[PDB]
Amino acid sequence: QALLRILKETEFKKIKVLGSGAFGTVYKGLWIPEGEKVKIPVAIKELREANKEILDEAYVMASVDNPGNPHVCRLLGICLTSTVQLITQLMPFGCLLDYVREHKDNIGSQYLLNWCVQIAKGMNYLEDRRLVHRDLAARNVLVKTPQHVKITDFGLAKLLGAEEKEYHAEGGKVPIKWMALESILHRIYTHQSDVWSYGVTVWELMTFGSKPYDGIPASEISSILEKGERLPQPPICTIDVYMIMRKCWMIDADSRPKFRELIIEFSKMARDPQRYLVIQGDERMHLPSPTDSNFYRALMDEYLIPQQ
Ligand SMILES: */C(=C\C(=O)N1CCC[C@]1(C)C#Cc1cnccc1[C@H]1NC2=C(C(=O)NCC2)[C@@H]1Nc1cccc(Cl)c1OC)CN(C)C
Ligand code: NA
Ligand code: NA
């Protein structure tokens, strides 16, 4: 049962903007729950004003909060100020798209494959809750630590009813370059169209944050996919890794891998990481980990109106 803890704005202090974009505005803050002594670092999201959209996101997140999952962003509550704001635990390393672009020189094969495992685990949990995310992308994965990522942004997410296998969309803006062909052509979304987006997300990580189909207009994408063209092989990917991406982008949705299968295959690759990704100076790379004594030192348009 979806519940919402309303947190008083007086319980938040030191609110400062972190960034803005198509997602709206996100701030960081310190939440001091009433009758408690602990100051909790939080992230706070609003849209650029409308209140229906942000409450729909709150409902979806609350609906999948029990039992929850380590690789899925949890809603702490909402706040009612001049606008409605969503509250979550601050992810101090930011989004995974920025992280891979900024730390390319220290991202080894073990990190990339573990992120693939973790996103597939979070997505498998969401599929088990009948949730179709509809906006899986590297920009919507957050970094709690370099070793632990979480799926975020439930702005397009839809819950499927007991007797429903797909969601049919109306004319809202959607991320064409992350979408399955059937979603671009017929506005149909399923757990298997989220698998297509998962393949694009994996390609974004393996290219250290390249823009997919860069310089190609979104209106040409369905014709390119119908001709059999796909995103290119990233140079660090051995053939078995690229073949996972190509299976995610199959025309037949039911033939694409399942999230449960992707957890197993990427977990196998993470057991011998240098066999599956070839990265120069891989064994000499290191990213901060909570087990490191000095870990505390580290803590100091994509969306368019559909044409078909
Ligand atoms: C990503 C950049 C990015 O996200 N950045 C860069 C500067 C900091 C900021 C805005 C952030 C963040 C962040 C940190 N801790 C927790 C959550 C968030 C947050 N970021 C984004 C979220 C999202 O929903 N959409 C995309 C960006 C996200 N989620 C939040 C924030 C507050 C409350 C809730 Cl409940 C919540 O999740 C629903 C790359 N850019 C291209 C987007
Ligand atoms: Na949004
Ligand atoms: Na299959």
Three-state secondary structure call for residue 233:
coil
Looking at the fold, whether 38 and 171 belong to one and the same domain comes out as no
- The CATH number that applies at residue 166 is 1.10.510.10
Ligand 1 touching residue 86 (CB < 6 A) = yes
To which residue do tokens 């949990």 refer? 125
Sign of CA dihedral 221, 213, 176, 124: positive
Three-state secondary structure call for residue 200:
helix
Domain count, the chain: 2
- Give the residue among 96, 106, 100, 110 at the shortest CA–CA distance from 269: 110
Q: What is the DSSP string of 50-85?
A: -HHHHHHHHHHHHHT-SS--TTBPPP-EEEESSSEE
Contact indicator for 256, 192 with CB cutoff of 8 Å: yes
Residues in the chain: 308
Tokens of 150: 């979480």
Q: What is the resolution of this structure in A?
A: 1.6
> Binding site for ATP: residue ranges?
18-26, 45, 88-89, 153
Looking at the fold, whether 54 and 174 belong to one and the same domain comes out as no
A 10 A CB-CB count for 86 gives: 24
Looking at the fold, whether 40 and 62 belong to one and the same domain comes out as yes
| Residues contacting residue 127 through CB under 8 Å, at least 6 positions apart | 191, 194, 259
Encode 155-194: b = buried (16+ Cβ within 10 Å), e = exposed: bbbbebeeeeebbeeeeeebbbbbbbbbbbeebbbbbbbb
Residue finishing a domain among 53, 69, 89: 89
CA 59 to chain centre: 18
Query: In which domain, by residue range, is 278 found?
Result: 96-284
Ligand 1 touching residue 177 (CB < 6 A) = no
- Specify the experimental method: X-ray
Choose one of 4, 42, 45, 96 to mutate for the ligand 1 pocket test, by most ligand atoms within 8 angstroms of C-beta. 45
Residues forming the active site = 135
- Give the residue among 24, 48, 29, 53 at the shortest CA–CA distance from 39: 29
Ligand 1 touching residue 44 (CB < 6 A) = yes
Question: What backbone torsions phi and psi does residue 34 show, to the nearest 5 degrees?
Answer: -65, 140
| Residues contacting residue 244 through CB under 8 Å, at least 6 positions apart | 199, 202, 257, 262, 265, 266
Choose one of 5, 85, 95, 301 to mutate for the ligand 1 pocket test, by most ligand atoms within 8 angstroms of C-beta. 95
- Give the residue among 121, 137, 185 at the shortest CA–CA distance from 23: 137
Each as own residue / partner, the long-range contacts of residues 279-282 (CB below 8 Å, 24 or more positions apart, any chain) are: 279/107, 279/108, 279/109, 279/236, 282/108, 282/109
> Binding site: residue ranges?
18-26, 45, 88-89, 153
To which residue do tokens 């025309």 refer? 251
Q: What is the spatial distance between Cα 284 and Cα 92, in angstroms, rounded to a whole number?
A: 25
